Protein backbone atom coordinates (compact mmCIF):
# COMPACT_ATOMS: atom_id res chain seq x y z
CA UNK A 1 0.00 0.00 0.00
CA UNK A 2 1.00 3.29 -0.06
CA UNK A 3 2.80 5.81 2.28
CA UNK A 4 0.56 7.49 4.79
CA UNK A 5 3.00 9.82 5.61
CA UNK A 6 3.03 11.06 2.68
CA UNK A 7 -0.10 10.37 0.31
CA UNK A 8 -4.16 9.68 1.17
CA UNK A 9 -7.49 9.94 0.09
CA UNK A 10 -13.37 26.89 -11.14
CA UNK A 11 -10.93 23.25 -11.35
CA UNK A 12 -7.11 24.05 -13.54
CA UNK A 13 -7.26 24.21 -17.05
CA UNK A 14 -4.88 21.03 -17.35
CA UNK A 15 -6.38 18.87 -14.28
CA UNK A 16 -9.87 19.40 -16.39
CA UNK A 17 -8.75 18.29 -19.58
CA UNK A 18 -7.32 14.83 -18.57
CA UNK A 19 -9.87 14.09 -16.33
CA UNK A 20 -12.71 14.81 -19.17
CA UNK A 21 -10.71 12.38 -21.94
CA UNK A 22 -10.45 9.77 -19.22
CA UNK A 23 -13.95 10.10 -19.04
CA UNK A 24 -14.17 9.40 -22.25
CA UNK A 25 -11.91 6.14 -21.94
CA UNK A 26 -13.95 5.08 -18.51
CA UNK A 27 -17.27 5.94 -19.47
CA UNK A 28 -18.59 3.42 -16.60
CA UNK A 29 -15.80 4.78 -14.24
CA UNK A 30 -17.13 8.31 -13.34
CA UNK A 31 -15.34 8.50 -9.79
CA UNK A 32 -12.53 6.25 -9.29
CA UNK A 33 -10.18 5.99 -6.39
CA UNK A 34 -7.78 8.81 -6.72
CA UNK A 35 -4.69 9.55 -4.40
CA UNK A 36 -3.30 12.80 -3.46
CA UNK A 37 -0.35 14.51 -1.79
CA UNK A 38 -0.18 15.78 1.95
CA UNK A 39 2.03 18.56 1.40
CA UNK A 40 1.66 19.32 -2.61
CA UNK A 41 4.61 20.11 -4.49
CA UNK A 42 4.52 23.97 -4.87
CA UNK A 43 3.82 23.95 -1.60
CA UNK A 44 7.58 22.75 -0.79
CA UNK A 45 7.10 19.05 -0.60
CA UNK A 46 9.54 16.71 -2.49
CA UNK A 47 6.70 14.68 -4.29
CA UNK A 48 6.11 16.12 -7.70
CA UNK A 49 2.42 14.12 -8.38
CA UNK A 50 -0.58 16.33 -7.40
CA UNK A 51 -3.40 13.59 -8.14
CA UNK A 52 -3.15 9.70 -9.07
CA UNK A 53 -6.40 8.01 -10.61
CA UNK A 54 -6.93 4.36 -10.17
CA UNK A 55 -9.01 2.65 -12.47
CA UNK A 56 -10.46 -0.85 -12.76
CA UNK A 57 -10.19 -2.83 -15.77
CA UNK A 58 -11.92 -5.99 -15.90
CA UNK A 59 -10.37 -7.69 -18.50
CA UNK A 60 -10.66 -8.95 -22.41
CA UNK A 61 -8.50 -12.26 -23.24
CA UNK A 62 -10.19 -12.07 -26.69
CA UNK A 63 -7.78 -8.76 -27.38
CA UNK A 64 -4.60 -9.65 -25.77
CA UNK A 65 -5.48 -7.64 -22.06
CA UNK A 66 -5.65 -9.57 -19.05
CA UNK A 67 -7.54 -8.19 -15.88
CA UNK A 68 -5.60 -5.61 -14.29
CA UNK A 69 -5.39 -1.86 -12.53
CA UNK A 70 -4.71 1.17 -14.11
CA UNK A 71 -2.85 4.25 -12.85
CA UNK A 72 -3.10 7.87 -14.58
CA UNK A 73 -0.64 10.17 -12.58
CA UNK A 74 -1.84 14.26 -12.77
CA UNK A 75 1.58 16.26 -12.14
CA UNK A 76 4.22 16.02 -14.64
CA UNK A 77 2.09 18.44 -17.31
CA UNK A 78 1.06 21.43 -16.60
CA UNK A 79 -2.27 21.10 -14.83
CA UNK A 80 -2.81 24.94 -13.11
CA UNK A 81 -1.12 27.31 -16.03
CA UNK A 82 0.00 29.90 -13.28
CA UNK A 83 3.95 29.12 -13.06
CA UNK A 84 3.51 27.39 -10.08
CA UNK A 85 5.45 24.33 -10.66
CA UNK A 86 6.10 24.75 -14.88
CA UNK A 87 7.08 27.66 -16.12
CA UNK A 88 5.87 28.97 -19.62
CA UNK A 89 7.86 30.30 -22.38
CA UNK A 90 5.09 31.23 -24.18
CA UNK A 91 7.19 29.16 -27.34
CA UNK A 92 6.50 25.74 -26.21
CA UNK A 93 3.74 23.29 -27.18
CA UNK A 94 4.16 20.75 -24.24
CA UNK A 95 2.19 21.21 -21.42
CA UNK A 96 4.77 20.88 -18.32
CA UNK A 97 7.38 18.30 -19.14
CA UNK A 98 5.02 16.87 -22.40
CA UNK A 99 3.39 13.88 -20.59
CA UNK A 100 1.97 11.76 -17.74
CA UNK A 101 2.60 8.52 -16.31
CA UNK A 102 0.71 5.81 -16.84
CA UNK A 103 0.71 1.88 -15.02
CA UNK A 104 -1.00 -1.41 -16.01
CA UNK A 105 -0.90 -3.62 -12.95
CA UNK A 106 -2.28 -7.03 -13.54
CA UNK A 107 -4.37 -8.28 -10.53
CA UNK A 108 -3.12 -11.60 -8.92
CA UNK A 109 -5.26 -14.61 -8.71
CA UNK A 110 -5.54 -13.43 -5.05
CA UNK A 111 -7.32 -10.41 -6.32
CA UNK A 112 -8.67 -12.44 -9.21
CA UNK A 113 -11.04 -14.65 -6.67
CA UNK A 114 -12.66 -11.79 -5.77
CA UNK A 115 -14.04 -9.93 -8.86
CA UNK A 116 -16.15 -12.52 -10.13
CA UNK A 117 -16.04 -15.54 -7.22
CA UNK A 118 -15.61 -14.85 -3.89
CA UNK A 119 -17.74 -11.48 -3.30
CA UNK A 120 -19.37 -8.61 -5.78
CA UNK A 121 -18.75 -5.80 -3.10
CA UNK A 122 -16.67 -3.25 -4.40
CA UNK A 123 -12.84 -4.09 -5.25
CA UNK A 124 -10.41 -0.96 -4.37
CA UNK A 125 -7.05 -1.13 -6.32
CA UNK A 126 -3.88 -1.84 -5.04
CA UNK A 127 -1.97 1.72 -4.16
CA UNK A 128 1.66 0.76 -3.79
CA UNK A 129 2.26 1.87 -7.63
CA UNK A 130 1.47 5.15 -5.89
CA UNK A 131 4.43 5.17 -4.14
CA UNK A 132 6.19 4.02 -7.61
CA UNK A 133 5.02 6.99 -9.60
CA UNK A 134 6.14 9.69 -7.70
CA UNK A 135 9.62 8.02 -7.51
CA UNK A 136 9.85 7.99 -11.05
CA UNK A 137 7.76 11.68 -11.25
CA UNK A 138 11.16 12.63 -8.88
CA UNK A 139 13.22 10.72 -10.82
CA UNK A 140 11.75 13.03 -14.20
CA UNK A 141 11.65 16.24 -12.26
CA UNK A 142 15.71 15.94 -10.86
CA UNK A 143 17.38 14.73 -14.25
CA UNK A 144 15.45 17.06 -16.04
CA UNK A 145 14.80 13.89 -18.54
CA UNK A 146 11.37 13.58 -20.53
CA UNK A 147 10.04 10.53 -21.47
CA UNK A 148 9.99 9.03 -24.90
CA UNK A 149 8.02 6.29 -26.49
CA UNK A 150 11.10 3.75 -26.11
CA UNK A 151 13.22 5.14 -23.32
CA UNK A 152 14.12 3.41 -20.63
CA UNK A 153 14.62 3.83 -17.16
CA UNK A 154 17.48 1.93 -15.24
CA UNK A 155 16.22 1.22 -12.09
CA UNK A 156 17.63 -1.63 -9.72
CA UNK A 157 15.21 -2.22 -7.28
CA UNK A 158 11.68 -4.13 -7.52
CA UNK A 159 8.57 -1.77 -8.32
CA UNK A 160 6.33 -2.56 -5.02
CA UNK A 161 9.91 -2.30 -2.73
CA UNK A 162 9.06 -6.88 -2.20
CA UNK A 163 12.15 -9.24 -1.37
CA UNK A 164 9.86 -11.72 -4.29
CA UNK A 165 9.67 -9.66 -7.49
CA UNK A 166 12.40 -10.11 -10.36
CA UNK A 167 11.32 -7.22 -12.55
CA UNK A 168 13.39 -4.47 -11.12
CA UNK A 169 13.25 -2.02 -14.17
CA UNK A 170 11.53 0.31 -16.61
CA UNK A 171 10.21 0.32 -20.09
CA UNK A 172 8.28 3.44 -21.77
CA UNK A 173 5.43 2.84 -24.26
CA UNK A 174 2.73 4.58 -26.07
CA UNK A 175 -0.42 3.72 -23.53
CA UNK A 176 -3.07 2.06 -26.12
CA UNK A 177 -5.94 3.43 -24.39
CA UNK A 178 -4.59 7.19 -23.91
CA UNK A 179 -3.14 8.82 -27.13
CA UNK A 180 -2.17 12.44 -26.88
CA UNK A 181 -4.49 15.40 -25.32
CA UNK A 182 -4.67 18.97 -26.45
CA UNK A 183 -5.12 21.24 -23.35
CA UNK A 184 -5.21 24.54 -22.54
CA UNK A 185 -2.01 24.43 -20.90
CA UNK A 186 -0.08 22.58 -24.26
CA UNK A 187 0.12 19.15 -25.24
CA UNK A 188 0.37 15.78 -22.74
CA UNK A 189 1.17 12.66 -24.20
CA UNK A 190 0.67 9.17 -21.66
CA UNK A 191 3.77 7.48 -21.18
CA UNK A 192 2.86 3.59 -19.74
CA UNK A 193 5.65 2.36 -17.46
CA UNK A 194 6.63 -1.07 -18.00
CA UNK A 195 8.44 -3.51 -15.23
CA UNK A 196 11.11 -5.38 -17.47
CA UNK A 197 14.11 -7.57 -16.37
CA UNK A 198 18.09 -6.43 -16.71
CA UNK A 199 18.84 -8.59 -19.80
CA UNK A 200 15.36 -7.05 -20.97
CA UNK A 201 16.97 -3.45 -20.05
CA UNK A 202 20.28 -4.44 -21.59
CA UNK A 203 18.57 -5.03 -24.95
CA UNK A 204 16.51 -1.92 -25.21
CA UNK A 205 19.30 0.37 -24.49
CA UNK A 206 21.71 -1.46 -27.08
CA UNK A 207 19.19 -1.73 -29.48
CA UNK A 208 15.70 0.07 -29.08
CA UNK A 209 12.88 0.24 -26.76
CA UNK A 210 9.86 -0.44 -29.37
CA UNK A 211 11.40 -3.36 -30.51
CA UNK A 212 11.85 -5.08 -26.92
CA UNK A 213 8.37 -3.65 -26.63
CA UNK A 214 7.41 -5.73 -29.66
CA UNK A 215 8.40 -8.72 -28.19
CA UNK A 216 6.67 -8.36 -25.06
CA UNK A 217 3.52 -7.74 -26.89
CA UNK A 218 3.76 -10.97 -28.94
CA UNK A 219 2.36 -13.01 -25.97
CA UNK A 220 0.45 -13.24 -22.68
CA UNK A 221 2.56 -14.42 -20.72
CA UNK A 222 4.92 -11.03 -21.40
CA UNK A 223 2.22 -8.45 -20.95
CA UNK A 224 -0.13 -8.92 -23.64
CA UNK A 225 -1.35 -6.13 -25.99
CA UNK A 226 -1.92 -3.33 -23.79
CA UNK A 227 1.65 -4.24 -22.27
CA UNK A 228 0.34 -4.77 -18.63
CA UNK A 229 2.66 -5.59 -15.84
CA UNK A 230 3.02 -8.84 -14.09
CA UNK A 231 4.98 -9.05 -10.96
CA UNK A 232 5.06 -12.54 -10.41
CA UNK A 233 6.53 -12.84 -14.02
CA UNK A 234 9.84 -15.80 -13.82
CA UNK A 235 11.50 -15.12 -17.03
CA UNK A 236 12.45 -12.48 -19.65
CA UNK A 237 11.37 -12.59 -23.34
CA UNK A 238 14.52 -14.01 -24.52
CA UNK A 239 14.63 -16.74 -21.61
CA UNK A 240 10.74 -18.03 -22.66
CA UNK A 241 11.31 -17.39 -26.54
CA UNK A 242 14.88 -17.72 -27.41
CA UNK A 243 13.86 -16.84 -30.81
CA UNK A 244 13.43 -13.20 -30.17
CA UNK A 245 17.00 -13.42 -29.90
CA UNK A 246 17.21 -14.03 -33.62
CA UNK A 247 15.14 -11.45 -34.47
CA UNK A 248 16.73 -9.11 -32.16
CA UNK A 249 19.92 -9.60 -33.96
CA UNK A 250 18.44 -8.88 -37.40
CA UNK A 251 17.09 -5.79 -36.90
CA UNK A 252 19.81 -4.50 -34.84
CA UNK A 253 22.08 -5.17 -37.68
CA UNK A 254 19.56 -2.85 -39.96
CA UNK A 255 18.76 -0.76 -37.25
CA UNK A 256 21.50 0.09 -35.58
CA UNK A 257 21.64 1.17 -31.91
CA UNK A 258 19.66 3.95 -29.75
CA UNK A 259 22.11 4.78 -27.52
CA UNK A 260 23.57 8.02 -27.56
CA UNK A 261 26.28 7.61 -24.94
CA UNK A 262 28.07 6.39 -22.05
CA UNK A 263 29.58 7.69 -18.79
CA UNK A 264 33.29 6.76 -19.21
CA UNK A 265 36.42 7.33 -17.82
CA UNK A 266 39.03 8.99 -20.41
CA UNK A 267 42.21 10.76 -21.75
CA UNK A 268 43.30 11.50 -24.39
CA UNK A 269 46.50 13.46 -25.95
CA UNK A 270 47.54 15.15 -29.05
CA UNK A 271 49.65 12.98 -31.22
CA UNK A 272 52.24 15.81 -32.63
CA UNK A 273 55.46 15.76 -34.05
CA UNK A 274 56.07 19.13 -34.66
CA UNK A 275 55.93 22.25 -32.20
CA UNK A 276 54.36 22.50 -28.85
CA UNK A 277 51.45 21.07 -27.68
CA UNK A 278 49.18 24.01 -25.74
CA UNK A 279 47.43 24.33 -22.93
CA UNK A 280 43.79 23.89 -24.53
CA UNK A 281 44.41 20.63 -25.76
CA UNK A 282 45.48 19.01 -22.59
CA UNK A 283 43.68 16.55 -20.76
CA UNK A 284 45.07 17.79 -17.09
CA UNK A 285 45.17 21.54 -17.54
CA UNK A 286 41.23 21.50 -19.54
CA UNK A 287 40.17 19.31 -16.82
CA UNK A 288 41.15 21.81 -14.23
CA UNK A 289 39.62 24.65 -15.89
CA UNK A 290 36.29 22.39 -16.12
CA UNK A 291 35.92 22.13 -12.41
CA UNK A 292 36.79 25.68 -11.10
CA UNK A 293 33.59 27.80 -11.64
CA UNK A 294 14.00 21.00 -10.52
CA UNK A 295 16.05 20.91 -13.70
CA UNK A 296 14.91 22.55 -16.77
CA UNK A 297 17.09 20.59 -19.01
CA UNK A 298 18.04 17.01 -19.54
CA UNK A 299 21.21 15.43 -18.61
CA UNK A 300 23.88 13.05 -20.15
CA UNK A 301 22.68 11.12 -22.48
CA UNK A 302 19.22 11.67 -22.79
CA UNK A 303 20.78 15.26 -23.85
CA UNK A 304 21.93 13.24 -26.97
CA UNK A 305 19.29 11.09 -27.63
CA UNK A 306 17.29 13.66 -29.58
CA UNK A 307 19.31 13.67 -33.22
CA UNK A 308 21.32 10.67 -33.40
CA UNK A 309 21.40 12.77 -36.94
CA UNK A 310 22.87 16.13 -35.72
CA UNK A 311 24.67 17.70 -33.20
CA UNK A 312 22.68 21.24 -33.19
CA UNK A 313 21.53 22.85 -30.24
CA UNK A 314 22.72 19.78 -28.30
CA UNK A 315 25.70 19.60 -25.82
CA UNK A 316 26.88 16.72 -23.92
CA UNK A 317 27.80 19.01 -21.25
CA UNK A 318 26.86 20.34 -18.09
CA UNK A 319 28.89 23.59 -18.56
CA UNK A 320 30.87 24.64 -21.69
CA UNK A 321 33.58 27.07 -22.24
CA UNK A 322 33.19 30.02 -24.41
CA UNK A 323 35.77 28.68 -26.96
CA UNK A 324 36.11 30.75 -30.60
CA UNK A 325 37.79 27.79 -32.61
CA UNK A 326 37.73 24.16 -32.69
CA UNK A 327 41.28 24.02 -32.57
CA UNK A 328 42.32 20.64 -34.77
CA UNK A 329 44.53 18.08 -33.78
CA UNK A 330 47.26 16.50 -36.11
CA UNK A 331 46.91 13.00 -33.92
CA UNK A 332 44.78 12.14 -31.31
CA UNK A 333 45.73 8.97 -28.35
CA UNK A 334 42.50 7.90 -27.16
CA UNK A 335 42.81 5.25 -23.38
CA UNK A 336 39.77 4.33 -22.18
CA UNK A 337 39.08 2.32 -19.20
CA UNK A 338 38.47 -1.70 -19.76
CA UNK A 339 34.89 -1.28 -18.20
CA UNK A 340 33.75 0.65 -21.33
CA UNK A 341 35.19 -1.15 -23.95
CA UNK A 342 32.00 -2.78 -24.60
CA UNK A 343 30.55 -0.04 -26.14
CA UNK A 344 33.57 0.93 -29.11
CA UNK A 345 31.81 -1.74 -31.52
CA UNK A 346 28.50 -0.02 -29.86
CA UNK A 347 29.80 2.82 -31.31
CA UNK A 348 31.19 1.82 -34.48
CA UNK A 349 28.86 -1.32 -35.26
CA UNK A 350 25.82 0.22 -34.27
CA UNK A 351 26.16 3.90 -34.21
CA UNK A 352 29.13 5.49 -37.02
CA UNK A 353 27.73 3.02 -39.67
CA UNK A 354 24.62 4.04 -39.53
CA UNK A 355 25.25 7.80 -39.87
CA UNK A 356 24.76 8.58 -36.07
CA UNK A 357 27.40 9.56 -33.10
CA UNK A 358 28.30 8.09 -29.90
CA UNK A 359 29.88 10.13 -26.86
CA UNK A 360 31.85 9.12 -24.01
CA UNK A 361 31.18 11.52 -21.39
CA UNK A 362 34.04 11.46 -18.66
CA UNK A 363 34.26 13.65 -15.43
CA UNK A 364 34.21 16.78 -16.57
CA UNK A 365 34.93 16.75 -20.38
CA UNK A 366 33.54 14.51 -23.35
CA UNK A 367 34.35 12.87 -26.07
CA UNK A 368 32.14 12.21 -28.94
CA UNK A 369 32.91 9.79 -32.13
CA UNK A 370 31.24 11.19 -35.84
CA UNK A 371 30.07 10.00 -38.88
CA UNK A 372 31.12 11.59 -42.14
CA UNK A 373 26.63 12.41 -42.14
CA UNK A 374 26.46 14.07 -38.85
CA UNK A 375 25.61 17.56 -39.05
CA UNK A 376 26.55 21.07 -36.63
CA UNK A 377 30.40 19.27 -36.31
CA UNK A 378 33.45 21.10 -35.92
CA UNK A 379 34.63 18.53 -37.66
CA UNK A 380 35.82 17.63 -41.24
CA UNK A 381 37.67 14.89 -43.27
CA UNK A 382 40.55 17.14 -43.56
CA UNK A 383 40.49 18.02 -40.28
CA UNK A 384 38.91 15.13 -38.40
CA UNK A 385 40.25 15.50 -34.75
CA UNK A 386 39.00 18.59 -32.58
CA UNK A 387 38.56 20.29 -29.42
CA UNK A 388 35.65 22.49 -28.87
CA UNK A 389 36.29 24.17 -25.02
CA UNK A 390 35.53 21.26 -23.00
CA UNK A 391 34.30 18.96 -26.14
CA UNK A 392 36.27 16.20 -28.06
CA UNK A 393 35.34 15.57 -31.40
CA UNK A 394 36.43 12.72 -33.54
CA UNK A 395 35.60 12.08 -37.26
CA UNK A 396 35.47 8.43 -38.50
CA UNK A 397 35.33 8.42 -42.27
CA UNK A 398 33.23 5.58 -43.72
CA UNK A 399 36.32 3.63 -45.27
CA UNK A 400 37.46 3.08 -41.52
CA UNK A 401 34.32 1.72 -40.46
CA UNK A 402 35.52 -1.84 -42.13
CA UNK A 403 38.63 -1.71 -40.61
CA UNK A 404 37.72 -0.69 -37.18
CA UNK A 405 35.24 -3.32 -36.49
CA UNK A 406 37.82 -5.65 -38.02
CA UNK A 407 40.51 -4.99 -35.31
CA UNK A 408 38.38 -4.82 -32.56
CA UNK A 409 37.62 -8.24 -33.42
CA UNK A 410 41.02 -9.30 -33.40
CA UNK A 411 41.63 -7.67 -29.91
CA UNK A 412 38.73 -9.61 -28.49
CA UNK A 413 36.42 -6.62 -28.42
CA UNK A 414 32.60 -8.40 -27.78
CA UNK A 415 29.54 -6.68 -26.36
CA UNK A 416 30.38 -9.04 -23.07
CA UNK A 417 34.25 -8.38 -23.40
CA UNK A 418 36.15 -6.39 -20.14
CA UNK A 419 40.43 -7.11 -21.45
CA UNK A 420 42.44 -7.64 -18.33
CA UNK A 421 45.49 -6.98 -20.49
CA UNK A 422 46.30 -3.74 -21.86
CA UNK A 423 45.49 -3.12 -25.37
CA UNK A 424 47.15 -0.83 -28.42
CA UNK A 425 45.52 -0.79 -31.00
CA UNK A 426 46.71 1.97 -33.82
CA UNK A 427 46.14 3.58 -37.53
CA UNK A 428 49.31 5.55 -38.75
CA UNK A 429 47.82 6.43 -41.87
CA UNK A 430 44.98 8.47 -39.45
CA UNK A 431 46.98 9.21 -36.96
CA UNK A 432 44.47 7.96 -34.59
CA UNK A 433 45.96 5.47 -31.32
CA UNK A 434 43.86 3.66 -29.14
CA UNK A 435 44.43 2.46 -25.96
CA UNK A 436 42.34 -0.31 -23.11
CA UNK A 437 43.84 0.50 -20.31
CA UNK A 438 43.15 2.39 -16.96
CA UNK A 439 44.18 6.40 -17.56
CA UNK A 440 47.25 7.18 -15.95
Not at 139 to 151: E, K, P, V
Request: with cysteine; charged share 25%; hydrophobic share 35%.
Amino acid sequence: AMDPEFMAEKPPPGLKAIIDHLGQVYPNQPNPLQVTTLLKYWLGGQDPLDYISMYNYPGDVDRNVPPHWHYISFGLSDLHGDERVHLREEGVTRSGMGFELTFRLAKTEIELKQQIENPEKPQRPPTWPANLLQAIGRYCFQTGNGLCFGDNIPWRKSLDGSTTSKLQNLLVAQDPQLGCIDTPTGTVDFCQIVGVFDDELEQASRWNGRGVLNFLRQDMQTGGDWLVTNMDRQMSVFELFPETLLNLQDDLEKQGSDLAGVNADFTFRELKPTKEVKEEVDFQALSEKCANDKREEPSFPQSMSMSSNSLHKSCPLDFQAQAPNCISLDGIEITLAPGVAKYLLLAIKDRIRHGRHFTFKAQHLALTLVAESVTGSAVTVNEPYGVLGYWIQVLIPDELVPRLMEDFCSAGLDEKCEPKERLELEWPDKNLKLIIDQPE
